[PDB]
């Protein structure tokens, strides 16, 4: 077994996921710290808990008492987040103007760091709402055993890149619900636009259909504005994970050509794989011939120096465990040049480039009526 | 074609001016790097065979290309392949020793992309063979002259791609 | 092929085929099943020719399989016998073609430049093909191995 368990049980999941590359790591006020350390951890908290939302110095006075208590070290960090989420600030950004799906979904993000798994869970937390208010919702999220086990009392919440992911669609959610480093929650939801003068804006929800019914968020929404993208690890995948931008001046001819190309590439692909099984060890009959005539060809070592040995006689020093077959620098260096040389490998990359292009077309062909044809 | 000197006389000539201090600084730059370009061309002239052999051995052999149905299959194709690597090395040396890649524009990269896309020569395998010659050649001539040859091999690779 | 060569020949002379060349095509198409017998026998006996010819090659010429030669090691020896298998295949193509054109264009045009680019001594290649000529002449009749053996002789003359 490669891995023990989920995000909570063990942390092998964090070690070989995207988590290591990201600035999505926990932050701690370590003992007695100066203003530089206090101010760092307090802002990293404000960035996560408000989701890059924008706190003026007037709105900081709302949160100020609690901020001071955390600067002590009297309050644990989870009780600090509790006092952050109970603030009238955090009510005004999120509880005041939101639909319930959107809202509950938010406190999963800011409190737990994860996107909601199923509709049943979402409904459970809504039933906790109608039971005992906003306050006992917040209390229910912070006092959860999964929360305590993952974060502890110290660590500010972060986006957990636990490679387990109960539902893949919940991953696609979790990258969609946080839209990258530039974005914020007011941008993702049109609270600002809807509201007059940058305020009193109702929060819009999307993906409700994906909570209710078995759906999937778009490759666009997960590919354009993402922690996957901000924590980019500079990958030479011939696969581009980035979406190609939508080209202008698209015509239907350009798209029938690409569809036909994709289908031709799929056919050639299946044929080449099926052959690939056929290859076996073509070299193997000759290999077996050489294995047969081994007593003539194989030769024992002469123990000597460079001087005083008959020519073409192997010394025990030049029993290199790569000179024993007769390989070379090439032979260890071969699989790195294999993308161009291999037929099958060459085809797979072409397929994928063709598929990315096909989608980018499927966007662009959608535009109708008023298009300047080219 | 044109070297760095001819290019300076082109700019100064096409302005109508004479040679000012900037152009003389450019001629001083070329005349400083002169000797280095000479010995680099001497070394590449010495070891062209081994550059092509080591680079073909790293980049192309024991793959689908020299297996049947690949482009390199048959003797005629193999010899044409290593012949083209000889041209890339030779004209890369000309471009280095002139200090101006205009020769690569005139006599190599003209119509070459249309040729290889006409035949069905794989572009990427060609580029990787050229980069193999870049590594081996830079290993022979050293750091500075390996940088100079690096810009001309990279110029041909940018020409094909 | 003989058909290709005749058509190309009177095509470059811009005339129809001569009665002489048409008699040559008649003699060719009547000699067909004998040729297909020859290439059938060299087809189904290829492993003895490659193995035994490789043994006579390495026994006559202990250079290349010695440490420091080109064909030293198991992989390199396998590649050496792989090439002898190639020239045996091309000789069979030349037998059914009734002409060395298949042999020349698949195998011989630019062979010296290839094996000089591999570091392989081409005289050892010619000695290998001569060894396969002796085995293949041991597997055939008198006139039969005269004909097939002469296609091998053409490949030897191209290597040397």
């Amino acid at each position: 077994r490669v891995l023990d368990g989920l995000d909570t049980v063990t942390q092998d999941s964090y070690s070989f996921s995207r988590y290591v590359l990201g600035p999505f790591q926990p932050s701690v006020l370590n003992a007695n710290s100066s203003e530089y350390e206090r101010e760092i951890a307090i802002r990293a908290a404000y960035r996560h808990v408000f989701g890059n939302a924008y706190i003026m110095e007037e709105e900081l006075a709302e949160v100020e008492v609690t901020a001071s208590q955390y600067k002590l070290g009297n309050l644990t960090a989870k009780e600090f987040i509790r006092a952050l989420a109970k603030s009238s600030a955090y009510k005004t950004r999120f509880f005041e103007g939101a639909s319930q799906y959107r809202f509950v979904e938010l406190n999963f993000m800011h409190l737990l760091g994860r996107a909601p798994d199923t509709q049943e869970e979402v409904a459970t937390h809504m039933n906790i709402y109608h039971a005992k208010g906003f306050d006992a919702e917040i209390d229910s999220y912070i006092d959860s055993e999964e929360y305590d086990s993952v974060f502890g009392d110290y660590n500010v919440p972060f986006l957990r890149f636990r490679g387990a992911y109960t539902p893949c669609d919940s991953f696609n959610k979790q990258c969609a619900l946080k839209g990258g480093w530039a974005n914020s929650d007011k941008a993702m939801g049109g609270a600002a636009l809807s509201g007059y003068n940058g305020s009193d804006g109702r929060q819009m929800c999307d993906r409700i259909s994906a909570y209710v019914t078995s759906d999937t968020t778009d490759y666009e929404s997960v590919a354009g504005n993402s922690p996957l993208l901000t924590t980019s690890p500079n990958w030479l995948a011939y696969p581009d994970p980035a979406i190609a931008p939508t080209p202008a001046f698209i015509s239907p001819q350009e798209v029938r050509e690409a569809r036909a190309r994709v289908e031709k590439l799929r056919e050639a692909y299946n044929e080449e794989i099926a052959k690939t099984q056929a290859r076996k060890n073509a070299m193997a009959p000759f290999r077996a011939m050489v294995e047969d005539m081994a007593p003539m060809l194989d030769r024992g070592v002469t123990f000597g120096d460079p001087m005083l040995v008959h020519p073409e006689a192997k010394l025990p020093e030049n029993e290199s465990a790569l000179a024993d077959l007769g390989g070379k620098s090439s032979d260890y260096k071969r699989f790195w040049s294999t993308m161009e040389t291999n037929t099958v490998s060459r085809l797979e990359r072409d397929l994928e480039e063709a598929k990315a292009e096909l989608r980018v077309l499927e966007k662009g062909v959608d535009a109708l009526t008023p298009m300047s044809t080219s | 074609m044109q070297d760095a000197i001819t290019a300076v006389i082109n700019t100064a000539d096409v302005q109508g001016k004479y040679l000012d201090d900037n152009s003389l600084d450019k001629l001083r730059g070329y005349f400083e790097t002169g000797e280095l370009r000479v010995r680099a061309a001497a070394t590449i002239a010495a070891n062209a065979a081994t550059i092509i052999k080591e680079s073909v051995a790293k980049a192309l052999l024991y793959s689908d290309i020299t297996r049947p149905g690949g482009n390199m299959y048959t003797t005629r194709r193999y010899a044409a392949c290593i012949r083209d690597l000889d041209y890339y090395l030779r004209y890369a040396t000309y471009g280095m020793l002139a200090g101006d890649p205009s020769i690569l524009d005139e006599r190599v990269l003209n119509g070459l992309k249309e040729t290889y896309n006409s035949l069905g020569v794989p572009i990427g395998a060609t580029v990787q063979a050229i980069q193999a010659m870049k590594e081996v050649t830079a290993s022979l001539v050293g750091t500075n002259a390996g940088q100079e040859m690096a810009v001309y091999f990279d110029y041909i690779c940018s020409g094909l791609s | 092929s003989i058909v290709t060569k005749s058509i190309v020949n009177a095509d470059a002379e811009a005339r129809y085929l001569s009665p002489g060349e048409l008699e040559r095509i008649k003699s060719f198409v009547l000699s067909g099943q004998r040729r297909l017998r020859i290439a059938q026998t060299l087809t189904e006996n290829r492993e003895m020719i490659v193995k035994k010819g490789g043994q006579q090659l390495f026994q006559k010429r202990t250079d290349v399989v010695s440490p420091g030669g080109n064909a030293y090691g198991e992989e390199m020896t396998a590649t050496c016998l792989r090439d002898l298998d190639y020239y045996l295949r091309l000789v069979t193509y030349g037998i059914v073609a009734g002409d060395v054109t298949p042999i020349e264009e698949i195998g011989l045009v630019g062979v010296k430049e290839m094996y000089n680019s591999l570091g392989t001594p081409i005289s050892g290649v010619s000695e290998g093909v001569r060894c396969m000529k002796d085995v293949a002449c041991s597997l055939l009749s008198g006139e039969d191995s005269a004909e097939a053996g002469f296609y091998f002789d053409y490949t030897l003359g191209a290597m040397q």
């Binding site: - | 149905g69 690949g70 069905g120 794989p122 | 054109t101 264009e105 698949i106």
Partner: peptide, 11 residues
């Protein structure tokens, strides 16, 4: 899959 254009005996 990737045929090399040949008029006669190329492939």
């Amino acid at each position: 899959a990737y045929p090399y254009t040949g008029s006669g005996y190329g492939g």
